Amino acid sequence: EASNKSFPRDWVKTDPLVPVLGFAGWTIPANIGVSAFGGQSLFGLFTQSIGENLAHFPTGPALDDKFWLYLITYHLGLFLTITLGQIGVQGRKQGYW
Amino acid sequence: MKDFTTYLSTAPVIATIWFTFTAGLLIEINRYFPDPLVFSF
């Protein structure tokens, strides 16, 4: 490493467009209703469960709630979309292809 | 086949053959003279 003498402070080359665009690229397809959810959506059912579990705020969700499935799947896709958007943006600006 | 019989004279091959022989002799002795606890014959 002939470069990197002082650990640049901008180690994450931040683009504020990246989180917004990953969020919109995931949640908008996640707002498409499909046959498997009974016509509903993943984000729709996730927010529905968020509401149903905020109706008793202290009491957390159960093991049999289905809020955890929506949570984990939604955030799998969302984190993947956000990190791949950051990677793609900073590879486009930089080299990498 | 001088080299092959030199191979068969090696320590592991000769040991295998000799112990197969000894074990077979003991096994046949114990088949034809079963359960020899004492020398009585």
Binding site: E1, F37, I87 | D3, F4, Y7
Partner: protein
């Protein structure tokens, strides 16, 4: 073209003159023995082909032909199993009544009273109750006869002769050049598309045409002699159409993409056959078709001789980030130039695969009447788990061998390997910390519970009653897979396993598989597993990363991969070698997998396996894993001491060999401790005091007696330790589960 067949013609003369010269492959062993250390080194260096020569071509040729030898030996072994099933078996009797007849395929000769081992297994037969699962595998293949097993044995012997001929041919007659081995793209294309794709497709075809009809008739109560032979099902489409109506339509639905017509024999039922307790062979056939297509498309991924495909070098050299520097640059050369790197990766994944196989074959029993043969199930899990652990430790070993021998810092500058070696201290420090944290918060829980139970404070234990450590993530995953056919796998009729939840499948009154409930004891023992795994990883990864150099010894690569020490200096540098890190990782893999298989045995005997006498399941041990596996004294009392009553009381039975091997494995294990606790300097002096007595009587050998090298002392010790422990567990498990299951 670049991808082509390239061979040397008659490189090596087929001659016996080097058989008669032991140690020809080495320049340090060709000089003949003067000490017995030569006799040991001749066997330690026999297959270290990279220490015989240094050019990769002859190494690769030796490796190829030795693989052919291994395949020929495996074929001999398989033909022997099939032949013993054809000649020394109760298989035809077992097909007619698999729920009462114990599978046996080994008969003992009546010579020294050992005909007591020829036990009453059933079917008018006397022999050794086997635990290999070969009967269930043969019934799944649709054998139904000893003649078919005999001809499979003959075919296996023919294929073994073919493999040995091929080794001789590809070493001595037409041996491939180095550029032929380095065609990794074509090798992967053929091994994915052909070895795994065409192989899975051919097995799918066998299952479509032989296994499925034969087993559908076997499950319909048809006696195996009334069942049509496989060729009658191949020739007569009317019989297959009578069993599966989609065969009336032919192969037209396949080419017209009307694949749903084949839903008679290509299903997605999931769960288990309620008649056999095994997987639906229609699901299995569809599975093999699917993965055949998958591997056949996967084997068209790499670029060999036409423009289409990938260059793996490009993929690697393109995968780099801001954290990893140059990235995977220089790994294609590593893995096309070093056999030990490939062996490391391949052994790692093969052992992980064997363990995955173990975990997936008990939960989704793929063979008929396998789930209720509790001995077969336990033995298969234990066996493949052990093979996997051994392969993983070997992966560590050969990664270290690569790092010592084949690593070059010129080809690795600021790439992933350089950057891993450059922060090895952080890796190993955090691994050490997590190992200590896991050891505490896993085993100290058991110690806390033992102390509380001994103190008379069961309300202070980490139990399902007092202080619940519930594995809620695993419980959630269980519930999610159980409810998959409802939401997330709607075309599946049932879940993959009954272990997720639901009802039990009872075959012959015995439980084939039933839901496994996870509680505090399961939490504790899974964290024990994680702990032991992390420590094994610690030892092996420390041997890999510190194979070339350390803060203690900076020139460790010049000492080699396999050296005893550097000396008693620096306070003492014993076992700084990477070989010694493998030597210790073996002990820790043993300690890990022993608990793995103990957890499996107890969990199965307590919460899954058992009989359905009335409406209600009576488990083998009685469901005591939940309340007794919280303590070490529970594992000692309710598992080791209790379940040993079948192996120590087996004298006078057909299981007496298991008690004998129990005791003998104890003996071998303790005998390992003479080599592990001791050192070479005592034994050389004892040997010279004995050599005095031999010189006095003029029987002093010319090959001077030496003590075993330090490395060989450690190797003998760990080998005897593993053998004794594993055979002790083997005898204990088998004597227990043949009796109670």
């Amino acid at each position: 073209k670049k991808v082509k067949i390239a061979v040397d013609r008659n490189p090596v003369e087929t001659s016996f003159e080097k058989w008669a010269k032991p140690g020809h492959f080495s320049r340090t062993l060709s000089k003949g023995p003067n000490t017995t250390t030569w006799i040991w080194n001749l066997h330690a260096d026999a297959h270290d082909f990279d220490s015989h020569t240094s050019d990769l071509e002859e190494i690769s040729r030796k490796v190829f032909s030795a693989h052919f030898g291994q395949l020929g030996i495996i074929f001999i072994w398989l033909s022997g199993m099939y032949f013993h099933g054809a000649r020394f078996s109760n298989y035809e009797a077992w097909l007619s009544d698999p729920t009462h007849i114990k599978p046996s395929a080994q008969v003992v000769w009546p010579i020294v009273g050992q005909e007591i081992l020829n036990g009453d297994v059933g079917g008018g037969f006397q022999g050794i109750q086997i635990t290999s699962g070969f009967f269930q595998l043969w019934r799944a293949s649709g054998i139904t006869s000893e003649l078919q097993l005999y001809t499979t044995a003959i075919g296996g012997l023919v294929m073994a002769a073919a493999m040995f001929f091929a080794g001789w041919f590809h070493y001595h007659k037409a041996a491939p050049k180095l550029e032929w081995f380095q065609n990794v793209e074509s090798m992967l294309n053929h091994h994915l598309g052909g070895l795994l794709g065409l192989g899975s497709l051919a097995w799918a075809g066998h299952q479509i045409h032989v296994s499925l009809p034969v087993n559908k008739l076997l499950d319909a109560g048809v006696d195996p002699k009334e069942i049509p032979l496989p060729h009658d099902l191949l020739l007569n489409r009317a019989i297959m159409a009578d069993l599966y109506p989609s065969f009336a339509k032919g192969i037209a639905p396949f080419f017209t993409l009307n694949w749903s017509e084949y839903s008679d024999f290509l299903t997605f039922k999931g769960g288990l056959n309620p008649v056999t307790g095994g997987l639906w062979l229609s699901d299995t056939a569809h599975h093999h078709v699917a993965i055949a297509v998958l591997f056949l498309v996967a084997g068209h991924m790499y670029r060999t001789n036409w423009g289409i495909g990938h260059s793996m070098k490009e993929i690697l050299e393109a995968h780099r980030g801001p954290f990893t520097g140059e990235g995977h640059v220089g790994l294609y050369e590593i893995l096309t130039t070093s056999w030990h790197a490939q062996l490391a990766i391949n052994l790692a994944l093969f052992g992980s695969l064997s363990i995955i196989v173990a975990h997936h074959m008990y939960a989704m029993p793929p063979y008929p009447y396998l789930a209720t043969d509790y001995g077969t199930q336990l033995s298969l899990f234990t066996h493949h788990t052990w093979i996997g652990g051994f392969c993983i430790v070997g992966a560590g070993a050969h990664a270290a061998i690569f790092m010592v021998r084949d690593y070059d810092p010129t080809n690795n500058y600021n790439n992933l390997l350089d950057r891993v070696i450059r922060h090895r201290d952080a890796i190993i420090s955090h691994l050490n910390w997590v190992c200590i944290f896991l050891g505490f918060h896993s085993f100290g829980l058991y110690i806390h519970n033992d102390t509380m139970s001994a103190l008379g404070r069961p309300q202070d234990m980490f139990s399902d009653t007092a202080i619940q450590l519930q594995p809620v993530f695993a419980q959630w995953i269980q519930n999610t897979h159980f409810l998959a056919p409802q939401l997330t796998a709607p075309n599946a009729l049932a879940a993959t396993s009954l272990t997720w939840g639901g009802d039990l499948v009872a075959v012959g009154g015995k439980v084939a598989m039933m839901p496994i409930s996870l509680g505090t004891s399961d939490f504790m023992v899974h964290h024990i597993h994680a702990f032991t795994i992390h420590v094994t990883v610690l030892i092996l990864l420390k041997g890999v990363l510190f194979a070339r150099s350390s803060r203690l010894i900076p020139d460790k690569a010049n000492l080699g991969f396999r050296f005893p020490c550097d000396g008693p200096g620096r306070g003492g540098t014993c076992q700084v070698s990477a070989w010694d890190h493998v030597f210790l990782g073996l002990f820790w893999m043993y300690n890990s997998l022993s608990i793995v298989i103990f957890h499996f045995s107890w969990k199965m005997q307590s919460d899954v396996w058992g009989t359905v006498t009335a409406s209600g399941v009576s488990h083998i041990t009685g469901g005591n894993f939940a309340q007794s596996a919280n303590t070490i004294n529970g594992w000692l009392r309710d598992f080791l001491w209790a379940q040993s009553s079948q192996v120590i009381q087996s004298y006078g039975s057909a299981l007496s060999a298991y008690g004998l091997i129990f005791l003998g494995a104890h003996f071998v294990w303790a005998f390992s401790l003479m080599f592990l606790f001791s050192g070479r300097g005592y034994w050389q002096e004892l040997i010279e005091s004995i050599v005095w007595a031999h010189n006095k009587l003029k029987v002093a050998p010319a090959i001077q007696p030496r003590a075993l090298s330090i490395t060989q002392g450690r190797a003998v010790g760990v080998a005897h330790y593993l053998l004794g422990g594993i055979a002790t567990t083997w005898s204990f498990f088998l004597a227990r589960i043949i009796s109670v299951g």
